[PDB]
Amino acid sequence: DDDGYRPNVGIVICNRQGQVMWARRFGQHSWQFPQGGINPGESAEQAMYRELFEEVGLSRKDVRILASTRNWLRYKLPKRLVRWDTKPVCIGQKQKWFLLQLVSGDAEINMQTSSTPEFDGWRWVSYWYPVRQVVSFKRDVYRRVMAAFASVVMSLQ
Ligand SMILES: Nc1nc2c(ncn2[C@@H]2O[C@H](COP(=O)(O)CP(=O)(O)OP(=O)(O)O)[C@@H](O)[C@H]2O)c(=O)[nH]1
């Protein structure tokens, strides 16, 4: 359903110590989970693996999919950030999320695989910290994502 919401996939990568991977936006001081659009003809899961390698340098063999979200979670952009006169105009995102366990070493994370790298650093953070730190208009989504994944993450410790 074309609703003004652009289809998107997000990635929560965890370890065995209750932590998730938190990535620093390239040349910036702001942080986020990896995320990116789902292309026409693509499944959310295929899009997830693609952006996992493009943004984090990890492949299918480096992770286990522990959980995912069946349904969209939507946020609307802030009115001022709405890019008017663009095609297609986008009033927010509708997102599926995947919870991945990192089963390779931390050294396999490589954020330089693309020619326009999305991030320039990363660090482990406790799994609920992103909920408090994500830009305001994403917070309801992140609350729902982490509440769905919290039990699984903790069952590894
Ligand atoms: N001041 C801040 N602005 C933010 C933050 N996160 C996102 N944004 C702003 O909102 C815009 C949309 O960010 P989104 O993450 O929803 C999708 P984005 O367009 O950034 O990804 P690309 O496909 O790589 O262009 C983005 O271009 C920034 O201007 C943040 O932590 N702080």
Residue numbers in the entry: 3 to 159
Authors' own words:
In Escherichia coli and probably many other bacteria, RppH converts diphosphorylated 5′ ends of transcripts into monophosphorylated ends that accelerate subsequent cleavage by the 5′-monophosphate-stimulated endonuclease RNase E. Escherichia coli RppH can also remove pyrophosphate from triphosphorylated RNA with lower efficiency.
To understand how nucleotides inhibit the reaction of RppH with the RNA substrates, we determined 1.6–1.9 Å crystal structures of RppH bound to triphosphorylated nucleosides and/or their non-hydrolysable analogs, ppcpNs, which contain a methylene moiety instead of a bridging oxygen atom between α- and β-phosphates. Neither structure contains Mg2+ cations since their addition to the crystallization solution resulted in the loss of electron density map for nucleotides, even for non-hydrolysable substrate analogs and at pH values unfavorable for catalysis. In the absence of Mg2+, the map for nucleotides was of high quality although the occupancy of nucleotides was refined to lower than 100% in some cases. All of the nucleobases bind in the protein cleft where we previously observed specific binding of guanosine at the second position of an RNA ligand. In this cleft, the nucleobase is sandwiched between the guanidinium group of R27 and a hydrophobic pedestal formed by V137 and F139. Pyrimidines are locked in place by a hydrogen bond with S32, while purines are likely held by stronger cation–π interactions with R27. The sugar–phosphate moiety is oriented toward the catalytic site and forms several hydrogen bonds involving R27, Y77, Q95 and K140 in all of the structures. Thus, the NTP-bound structures demonstrate that NTPs interact with RppH in the same site where the second nucleotide of RNA binds RppH. In this position, NTPs can compete with RNA for RppH binding and inhibit the reaction of RNA substrates.
